[PDB]
Amino acid sequence: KEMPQPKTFGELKNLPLLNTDKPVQALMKIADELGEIFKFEAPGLVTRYLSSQRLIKEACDGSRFDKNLSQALKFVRDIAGDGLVTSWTHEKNWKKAHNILLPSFSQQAMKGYHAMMVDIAVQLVQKWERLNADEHIEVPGDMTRLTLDTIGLCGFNYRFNSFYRDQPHPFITSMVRALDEAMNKQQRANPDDPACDENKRQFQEDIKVMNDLVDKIIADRKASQSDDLLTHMLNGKDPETGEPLDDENIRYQIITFLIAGHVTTSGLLSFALYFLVKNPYVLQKAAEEAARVLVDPVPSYKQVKQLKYVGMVLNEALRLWPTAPAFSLYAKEDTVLGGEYPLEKGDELMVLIPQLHRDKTIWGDDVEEFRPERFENPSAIPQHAFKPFGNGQRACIGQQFALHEATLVLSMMLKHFDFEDHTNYELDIKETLTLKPEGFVVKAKSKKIPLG
Ligand SMILES: C=CC1=C(C)c2cc3[nH]c(cc4nc(cc5[nH]c(cc1n2)c(C)c5C=C)C(C)=C4CCC(=O)O)c(CCC(=O)O)c3C
Numbered sequence: 001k002e003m004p005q006p007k008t009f010g011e012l013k014n015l016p017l018l019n020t021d022k023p024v025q026a027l028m029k030i031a032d033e034l035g036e037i038f039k040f041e042a043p044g045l046v047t048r049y050l051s052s053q054r055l056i057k058e059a060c061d062g063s064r065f066d067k068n069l070s071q072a073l074k075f076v077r078d079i080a081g082d083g084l085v086t087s088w089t090h091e092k093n094w095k096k097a098h099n100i101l102l103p104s105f106s107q108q109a110m111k112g113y114h115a116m117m118v119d120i121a122v123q124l125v126q127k128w129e130r131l132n133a134d135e136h137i138e139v140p141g142d143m144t145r146l147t148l149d150t151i152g153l154c155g156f157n158y159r160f161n162s163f164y165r166d167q168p169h170p171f172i173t174s175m176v177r178a179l180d181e182a183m184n185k186q187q188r189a190n191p192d193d194p195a196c197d198e199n200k201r202q203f204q205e206d207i208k209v210m211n212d213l214v215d216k217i218i219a220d221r222k223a224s225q226s227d228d229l230l231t232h233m234l235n236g237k238d239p240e241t242g243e244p245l246d247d248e249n250i251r252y253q254i255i256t257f258l259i260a261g262h263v264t265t266s267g268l269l270s271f272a273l274y275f276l277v278k279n280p281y282v283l284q285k286a287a288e289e290a291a292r293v294l295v296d297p298v299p300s301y302k303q304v305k306q307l308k309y310v311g312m313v314l315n316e317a318l319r320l321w322p323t324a325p326a327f328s329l330y331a332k333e334d335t336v337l338g339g340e341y342p343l344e345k346g347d348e349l350m351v352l353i354p355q356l357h358r359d360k361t362i363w364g365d366d367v368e369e370f371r372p373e374r375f376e377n378p379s380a381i382p383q384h385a386f387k388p389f390g391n392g393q394r395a396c397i398g399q400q401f402a403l404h405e406a407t408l409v410l411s412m413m414l415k416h417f418d419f420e421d422h423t424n425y426e427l428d429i430k431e432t433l434t435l436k437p438e439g440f441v442v443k444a445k446s447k448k449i450p451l452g
Pocket residue numbers: 067084085098151256257260261262264265268322323324326327328388389390391393394395396397398399401402
């Protein structure tokens with residue numbers, strides 16, 4: 001079959017179609033017009049965007065396709081080097097770091113993180129309880145305060161003390177500015193032009209801020225006992241080679257986990273809360289479960305595992321707006337996709353996750369409605385229909401960490417407050433390689449239930 005491709009602009013090809021602040025949303029509109037697959041070309045790129053479970057199920061076969069670094073991820077390598085996210089599967093440090101850090105995400109490790117996650121969630125609850133009547137909540141801002149602090153405490157035993165700052169943490173400011181530069185570089189066809197020197201200086205300045213914090217984390221540990229993510233990074237030896245991670249890689253892993261370990265979870269919590277105030281029937285049902293299960297002043301690990309409906313609300317927020325909205329793959333050998341599209345070895349594919357999650361063949365005709373009930377029987381969902389955490393061996397290492405923290409936090413919010421969408425907030429999705437509802441604000445009225 002002849003592959004569909006959107007509008008071309010001479011030698012620029014499809015590049016001007018992504019001349020927007022919201023490229024993922026622009027690609028979803030192209031997908032709606034062209035269907036399950038389209039070719040996308042730009043000066044130094046050729047990729048194919050996949051939107052149907054039918055084709056994605058084939059692309060998710062590990063024997064035929066491996067993780068590829070998209071131009072977006074290639075730009076993030078300047079920040080996260082060969083850390084777990086921005087490394088090729090064949091690079092020595094991928095398997096080495098994967099095997100050394102995987103034990104940090106075990107059930108035993110999770111049970112150990114719980115108390116520190118509760119520490120940060122209590123801080124969020126107390127901030128909101130202490131607001132004056134007129135005051136509102138800047139939701140993404142406060143979700144970022146919680147998620148960054150959780151990964152800092154659980155993973156590195158370092159307190160960012162984000163709730164003791166009225167503006168975002170300086171690490172957040174530099175990170176956002178750096179990731180925005182990396183997303184913009186995709187539309188910058190002539191990067192060596194002297195006119196780009198100012199962006200290059202700023203990019204370098206933001207990377208320094210991030211690295212100064214990594215240095216403080218490292219210094220804190222050697223002066224400080226602990227068996228966390230940082231412990232495994234410094235002392236773990238690869239079972240295959242018998243050697244530990246080098247100093248250069250350890251630094252890349254810290255930056256990686258500080259970014260990956262919070263941005264996506266912050267976006268999820270903000271989206272989940274957005275959908276809850278927009279669907280009051282669902283809020284009531286989730287708040288009912290929170291009150292029924294969280295019978296103690298603080299949630300226990302066991303209680304979080306019983307919050308079924310809260311988990312369904314989180315999956316349904318990840319269905320509509322997967323906060324890491326795309327992942328890239330490459331053909332390991334010459335193959336034919338869906339028995340219609342021949343691919344040569346090395347040919348790139350892009351999985352457009354928000355489109356996959358809108359496939360009417362899988363979900364029904366009500367794809368745009370927020371219905372947690374879709375995840376009541378998770379066995380009924382076909383394989384590779386729901387992919388918020390990626391695929392195969394390169395899937396999210398922090399999936400369980402993220403869902404445990406988001407479940408715990410959302411349930412404590414629903415137990416302690418009643419929420420009001422006082423401005424009738426219109427959804428505005430900001431893209432910075434990840435998604436978030438920009439400008440999302442609420443008013444929270446305390447149910448006056450104490451903590452512990
Ligand atoms: C709602 C929360 C989250 C979402 C939607 C999420 C999504 C992802 N995380 C991925 C990879 C990853 N996620 C990772 C650690 C974290 N990720 C986390 C939370 C989330 N991670 C937390 C929390 C983490 C750490 C504590 C790392 C390190 C990788 C890289 C895994 C690898 O390739 O070995 C990928 C695969 C990307 C690719 O194929 O290029 C997706 C889509």
